[PDB]
Amino acid sequence: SRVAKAPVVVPAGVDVKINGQVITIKGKNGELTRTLNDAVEVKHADNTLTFGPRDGYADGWAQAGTARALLNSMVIGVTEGFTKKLQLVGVGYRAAVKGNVINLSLGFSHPVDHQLPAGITAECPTQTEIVLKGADKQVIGQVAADLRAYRRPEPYKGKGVRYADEVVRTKEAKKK
């Protein structure tokens, strides 16, 4: 509603293709496509995208808000781009990229090889740091969650795959 009523500014060099409910947003960083919920009426006009409810649909404003939010991060995606930074904490924990595969040593018997999806790229500036880069905000978010999942930050020493912006609360072990 307050989100839906806020227009998304499509910059110069960004192509917007609307075929009914299907929206393709082309830019310098890539091309993303989304199908908007039937309750959303998306209007182009000028250098902006405006979202609003469709008559006869109950949750129209809730839907238009989501649609807006999604198309804004799509525009930011195909331009600026997204960056997720993870950092490995604990003895022996190491990582490296070999093309589209993140090899991870995380205290297991077998090393973990994580295959990356289409659009997400990774590079290791250190043996203990992973930097993800992509256009789709959901996919970069998904991949960063899956990498964290291998060894979620333990609460006794903070060991494991953590987000760079992560506040890992630690606690003392039982007394005696």
Partner RNA sequence: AGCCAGGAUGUUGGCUUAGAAGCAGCCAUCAUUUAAAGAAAGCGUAAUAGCUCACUGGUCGAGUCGGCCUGCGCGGAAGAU
Partner RNA sequence: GAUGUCGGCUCAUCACAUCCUGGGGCUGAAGUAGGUCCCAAGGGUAUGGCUGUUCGCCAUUUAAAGUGGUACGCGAGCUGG
Per CB under 7 A, residues contacting RNA are: 2, 155-156, 171-174
For residue 15, the minimal CB distance to RNA (Å) is 28
Q: Which is nearer to RNA, 98 or 171 (CB)?
A: 171
Q: Which is nearer to RNA, 165 or 172 (CB)?
A: 172
Contacts of 28 (CB under 8 A, 6+ apart): 13, 78, 79
Contacts of 91 (CB under 8 A, 6+ apart): none
Going by the DSSP 8-state scheme, the letter that residue 176 receives in this structure is -
Dist CA 106 CA 88 (whole Å): 9
Tokens standing for residue 95: 């990582």
Q: Which is nearer to RNA, 6 or 131 (CB)?
A: 6
For residue 85, the minimal CB distance to RNA (Å) is 19
For residue 1, the minimal CB distance to RNA (Å) is 7
